[PDB]
Ligand binder design. Structure first.
Ligand code: NA
Ligand SMILES: [Zn+2]
Length: 258
């Protein structure tokens, strides 16, 4: 695709092809923890990932996605601020060239090394393509990564990155359990927002977990060896594939905790 994260095609350019970039409910945003409103009416999240079926991992030239079979209710997210059942379709990460940047959301302006997005769609709309046209179509769980101890359940992902180095490469990726990527606590902030890549549609209920997971320096190093470019093209490392924080405008961030 023409858009990307460089000087000449990066996020400050996206509005020319995707005028919704300057919309009223864009993501990501800075979460100001002292202005977030505790909402005692929010329920606990319900994450049911025991029957998840992963299929494939692929490099799509802006990140890598692990894709799941979403033809039945096998890995779903319910509760929290959601009505209805949302099915897991893929997850992916955004990360930096250095450990001090890489997350899309920030917390009191603090950036994390990377951010994991688990993308789910509202089953009342029948398919992911209809869901992205609706204001309550997607629910994305966002989890921050800090660098410290290794996360054992991430290792299977890091070990296959070698085989999908360039844009358009894919590999079989079965029996991966995404329960190994979740923190202990499910406390969260939530606000209505958008996809953070083109087409930037405003169809996402964001659910950002308060507790980061830790990954090792060697684990995130291996993400930085992937390439934006296709095979046999000049090498451009896949780093800093994050969009900067957007204005909050007329929105309230709610917290499930105090
Ligand atoms: Na995508
Ligand atoms: Zn993302």
């Amino acid at each position: 695709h023409h858009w990307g994260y460089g000087k000449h095609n990066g996020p400050e350019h996206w509005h020319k092809d995707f005028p919704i970039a300057k919309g009223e409910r864009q993501s990501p945003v800075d979460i100001d923890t002292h202005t977030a409103k505790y909402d005692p009416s929010l329920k606990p999240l319900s994450v049911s990932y025991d029957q998840a079926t992963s299929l494939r991992i692929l490099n799509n030239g802006h990140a890598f996605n692990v894709e799941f079979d979403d033809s039945q209710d096998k890995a779903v997210l319910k509760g929290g601020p959601l009505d209805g059942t949302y099915r897991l379709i893929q997850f992916h990460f955004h990360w930096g060239s250095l450990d001090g940047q890489g997350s899309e959301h920030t917390v009191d302006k603090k950036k994390y090394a990377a951010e994991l997005h688990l993308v789910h769609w509202n089953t009342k709309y029948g398919d992911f393509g209809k869901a992205v046209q609706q204001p309550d179509g997607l629910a994305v769980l966002g989890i921050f990564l800090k660098v410290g101890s290794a996360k054992p359940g991430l290792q299977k992902v890091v070990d296959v990155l070698d085989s999908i180095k360039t844009d358009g490469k894919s590999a079989d990726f079965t029996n991966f359990d995404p329960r190994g990527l979740l923190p202990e606590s499910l406390d969260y902030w939530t606000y209505p927002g958008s996809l953070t890549t083109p087409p930037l549609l405003e169809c996402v209920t964001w659910i950002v977990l308060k507790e980061p997971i830790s990954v090792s320096s060697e684990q995130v190093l291996k993400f930085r060896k992937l390439n934006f470019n296709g095979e046999g093209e000049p090498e451009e490392l896949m780093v800093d594939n994050w969009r900067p924080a957007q204005p909050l405008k007329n929105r309230q961030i709610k917290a499930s905790f105090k």
